[PDB]
Design a protein around this ligand. Sequence first.
Ligand SMILES: Nc1ncnc2c1ncn2[C@@H]1O[C@H](COP(=O)(O)OP(=O)(O)O)[C@@H](O)[C@H]1O
Ligand SMILES: [Mg+2]
Lengths: 51, 142, 94, 194, 34, 272, 140, 287, 36, 144, 52, 51
Amino acid sequence: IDINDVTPNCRVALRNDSYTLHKILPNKVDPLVSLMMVEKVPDSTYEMIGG
Amino acid sequence: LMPYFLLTQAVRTGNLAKFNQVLDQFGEKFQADGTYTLIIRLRHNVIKTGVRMISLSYSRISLADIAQKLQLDSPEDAEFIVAKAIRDGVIEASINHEKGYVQSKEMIDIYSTREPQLAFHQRISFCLDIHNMSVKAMRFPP
Amino acid sequence: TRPANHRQLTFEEIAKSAKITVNEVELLVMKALSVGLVKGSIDEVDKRVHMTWVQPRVLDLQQIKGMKDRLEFWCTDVKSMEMLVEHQAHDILT
Amino acid sequence: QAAELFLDTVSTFTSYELMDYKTFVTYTVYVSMIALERPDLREKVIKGAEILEVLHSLPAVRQYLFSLYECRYSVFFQSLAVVEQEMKKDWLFAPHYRYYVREMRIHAYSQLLESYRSLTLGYMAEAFGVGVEFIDQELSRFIAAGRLHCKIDKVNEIVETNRPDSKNWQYQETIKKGDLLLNRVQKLSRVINM
Amino acid sequence: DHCIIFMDEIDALMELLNQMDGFDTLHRVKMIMA
Amino acid sequence: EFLHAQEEVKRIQSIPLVIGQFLEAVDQNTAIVGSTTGSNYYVRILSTIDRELLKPNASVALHKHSNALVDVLPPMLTSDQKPDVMYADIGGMDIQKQEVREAVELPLTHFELYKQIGIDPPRGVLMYGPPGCGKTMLAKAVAHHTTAAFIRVVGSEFVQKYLGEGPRMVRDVFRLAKENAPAIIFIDEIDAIATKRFDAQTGADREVQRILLELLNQMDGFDQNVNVKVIMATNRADTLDPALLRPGRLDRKIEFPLPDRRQKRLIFSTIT
Amino acid sequence: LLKLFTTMELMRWSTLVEDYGMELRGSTEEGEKRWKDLKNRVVEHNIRIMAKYYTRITMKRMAQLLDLSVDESEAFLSNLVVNKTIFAKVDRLAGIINFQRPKDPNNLLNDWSQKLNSLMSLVNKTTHLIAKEEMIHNLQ
Amino acid sequence: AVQKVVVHPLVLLSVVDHFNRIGKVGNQKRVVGVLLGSWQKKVLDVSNSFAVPFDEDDKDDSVWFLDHDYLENMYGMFKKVNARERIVGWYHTGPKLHKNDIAINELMKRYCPNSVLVIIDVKPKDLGLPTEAYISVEEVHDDGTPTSKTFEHVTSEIGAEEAEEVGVEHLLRDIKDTTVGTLSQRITNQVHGLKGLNSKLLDIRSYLEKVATGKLPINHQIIYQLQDVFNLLPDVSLQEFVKAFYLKTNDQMVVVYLASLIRSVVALHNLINNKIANRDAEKKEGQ
Amino acid sequence: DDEFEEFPAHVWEDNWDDDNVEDDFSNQLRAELEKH
Amino acid sequence: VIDAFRLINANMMVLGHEPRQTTSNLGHLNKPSIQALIHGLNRHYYSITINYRKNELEQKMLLNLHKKSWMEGLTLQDYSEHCKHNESVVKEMLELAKNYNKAVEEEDKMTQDPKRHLEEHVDVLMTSNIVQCLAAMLDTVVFK
Amino acid sequence: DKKFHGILDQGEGVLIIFDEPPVDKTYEAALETIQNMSKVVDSLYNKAKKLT
Amino acid sequence: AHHTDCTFIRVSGSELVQKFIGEGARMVRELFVMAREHAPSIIFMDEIDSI
Ligand SMILES: Nc1ncnc2c1ncn2[C@@H]1O[C@H](COP(=O)(O)OP(=O)(O)O)[C@@H](O)[C@H]1O
Ligand SMILES: [Mg+2]
């Protein structure tokens, strides 16, 4: 992996042996809010509104 | 098949008069397709069909009561015809002339028996054969 | 003495054995079961006794020869079925 | 389907151009009796608000339905003769009265014999309000046709009931349906393998 | 499992789950809440 | 040899494993976990460990070495002290039983009746009434003849002290309701929090209004509930917020008056 | 008396009254109701003994074993059966009282399998004992 | 007394090694050693062993020199190594007992009152476990036959700690048998079961023939067990067993038939998929 | 595949019962009651 | 996890000599582990191969560990448990068959897990049923 | 109306009760699977014949 | 949200009001970090008067 992709405040995995970085994990923090992005799109449609 | 429609009606009813009418009325088609001896062997198996219905819904019908309900003459003729039906093995019953009745076979529960064994044996053998023939014939080109 | 094939003992059989008329063979089998000698049951509608067990005892040489003969027959049966199966499954024995 | 639709739109009869509501409820009762099992019949035609409200004004049809349900059978045949002569005159049921009568007769006989194993022919005749000869003839006919599960014994007049146990019936259904599937797969394989 | 129960010093209350639940226990055994 | 390999895999699914919380799904075949040791590792989950149920924030066992996730441990607070009162115990209030049932049970037992009409079941009803006429008991009785769960709370339990703890508890309660499929949530005394639109000029009336607003969000919002129901008892029924009283997606209304002569005779009969 | 009431064999009530009859001299006054109670216990112990040493007892014989009437025996069995104290199906038509629980095919074949398992274990142990016996007496 | 003696693979391999390392340098037939293990209820768990110098005259049959000083010193060393293991008897790699065995057991009873002699047969047989275990009993016989100090059988088994399963599995991985029922393996298992039943029945018959002809005395325990076996023989001609057997055979074969039908349908579907793949390949090649 | 040229060539699922009876169940029952 | 080691002389890797010569292709069939590399699997010590030595008698004595008795070969399976297993597997197979119908229809319309699960389940049912049935017949003949 | 497992017998005039063994769910599931495989072989007809 | 081709997020309610100080600001900032990471995005906030 190229160095430029290791930006500050990014989750990196280090070999349990030799502590060598070996991936750029999916940067993420604060589960309290990371559980907040909408995965299931609600079922309401513009046709359900009127007036 | 309409001529055979009429013929089947006649045989099911046991109406020899209507049978003769159908023969005299469509005999040419029978001699054409080729059936004209099987349709007299019919007459024979028409009386046989009567006795088969009688022995399909009854368990101890008395002979004097087969004579009538099979359109016969006498209990002696009943004896002979029903005995021959059993010999041909189309009614599967016994017979008793000490008192004169034709008791059938008390049906035995066919699941404590090897009949399910045998039936499923034929069907399993068949299914295995199709799996064999199907896995075979999976030719690959190169 | 009787093998398991027909170990059904009839009341008339018991009566012709130890001399008691058949209205207290029930009590004889009752006491036999109670003492712990013979296990089983009494089915007296058809007047029979299903002995499923017996107090094993000390036998004689003649009785041991009888057992040897029965073992011989049993071994013949076992070997016959053994050969049949091994001959008919020759291609699927790992 | 006639019974399904009629019972799903009996509470909402709005089509007075086709027939009167009395006629519609009578037709619902008739089709329901010929096409419905006893549980469903009780739930949806005898415990039915409107289908039982109109039967107060219709006295000859209430008797016909309740005879069968209560297992009063002589009245059931009386009302079945009534219904036959009515439907023959009718114009939508006219080429169906033989079949309706026959199938309701089979329903009645099967209902009676569903709770028996050896029903004396005389008693069954007395219950049905007929004779012994008539019952003999018609049971012979229906057993032959294969609808009923019963075998007659005329020397000592007794009608044994050879109903099949659950396991045995499941076996026979497996044989039949597996036979159909085997035929289809056999055709498929024979066709495509070669 | 151990009767007279003695929940004393009730006075001295920002607590709200301590309500008088009053469950059912083996008959006998009582309390003298004061 | 294929059989031997499969057995080696079944063996890698060992017994002495150590439990920990699976956090996220990094990629195909690989994921990030945090052991009960308190430290987080990145590992490869064994083939077919039900990646359907390996949802983020999951309880999972791990191979002591390689920390590989090789299990999903099936993971409470309320609705386990099975109720006792029954519909035979409650006397009278046939109307209240009818309405609470149609709102609470039938949506869970016969939802086909609702589809036929083409209706959204009324999840959320509120019971009026003098200080005591029997509403806690009808709630407990629906709990008796209930099949999903009965999670009971008291509004004080949301009025607890520390900012945001009331909203925290309401959100936890409704989240438990949802995670249970058909569950029911009951709030015993809502007059404490469910109030009017008072312009909170302090730091405390503002927090009480925050509790009510969180309640409104959870009952209806961008996360429409799935088969969850709500029941409230208030004892005043006049100063409740127009929002929470929204005669729409938030609540139905029921009356629980002083036992009339009829009801009172039934009271005597059932008690005596 | 206590010996008889703890013995797993039938006790005839008539002979019991002949033998231990004169030990009632509670069994006085309302001791006659208590006497009926003791007879009930005697009949009930007889029924337990039969249910454990029989499979089909004719009523014409069970009446003799209990000292009751052909109908009183039936009534007492019926009371026991409703109370769920003795398993007994009474085919009144033929006098075929049956204490056999209906045999499930599963249970019948399971009994067969347990017999065979015990058989194989016992032959193995017997073979080990035979090996020891030959190994010893061949030494001498 | 002790009912069960569970021996361990380390014990078995140690005995094999002892026998080999003495037979290579000489010819001693037997080799004799002590067994170390622990109790748990009446279930002895033999988990180690060690050779003790032995020498006997095969003619006299009462002159032998099991070395108790060596036994004590060696046990001291293994007690230092591991302490939850006390002498629980002895072993000797002779296919059959010997006259000395009772005297040797008397010697070893000094160090364990409950002594278990495990006759570990090095020669690999194909039907039985290699361990047969005995314990000495002197008691007034109930039948009034003169009493002498003789051995009595104690049930034996082979079991292993996980630390030894990890080793046996690795050593046998090359010639291992899949730990799953492949239909061929299960039919093989049943054939082997019949083999074993035949072998045991032949043994019983040979013993009974010897007893009848008189070359051996009668053992009432053996006769008891045999007549109990015959007692336990089942009946198959009985009707309400033939009915049940047919019923369950039919149920099992319905499951089999449904399985076969599903297999047939899947096979045809795969054949169709392949024929279509080949057809597409041929068409594309042509175009 | 191949048409075997060598061989020259209601909506009600009826199943027999098209017999000839003295009406289905009216005159039969009338006579039945009459003789009973 | 057993590894054998031996040291490297201080005047071996510093004098310009490889730690251990190589004349056969045998010494490069086993790869080293990073765990040992970190601590210097090739700076201070070797790694000699193991190559366990098994006679023909030790292997048999160890086979005795799990060797199944003739009893286990010829013993039937509890019929109640067997029927429950048949029922459960046939139901799960029914579910997979419904899914399989759906999958085949869908794939044939728009142009697998159901098929593979169905195959494994048919395997297990047939092996269980045939084994128990044959054991039953064998016993019915052998023990009478 | 299915209130108890018994059948009358109007000969000797006798009511015969019995315990009805539960419907073996194995064959129920089996018949359901036969039907579903019929659907599958129909779909396979379509696929094979119309792509070949 | 059902009709957008952009990351939809919800923050509705008192979710930003948590007991420990120096927590709400951190949460809002990390939420907008999430939004900027998965841009383009629409952040919904029901009952802003609460938060
Ligand atoms: N219809 C009723 N039948 C029997 N008891 C009743 C009834 N209504 C009220 N009660 C009594 O009232 C008590 C419960 O009152 P509750 O419903 O808690 O009133 P609230 O919750 O409004 O204070 C119970 O102890 C019960 O005995
Ligand atoms: Mg309350």
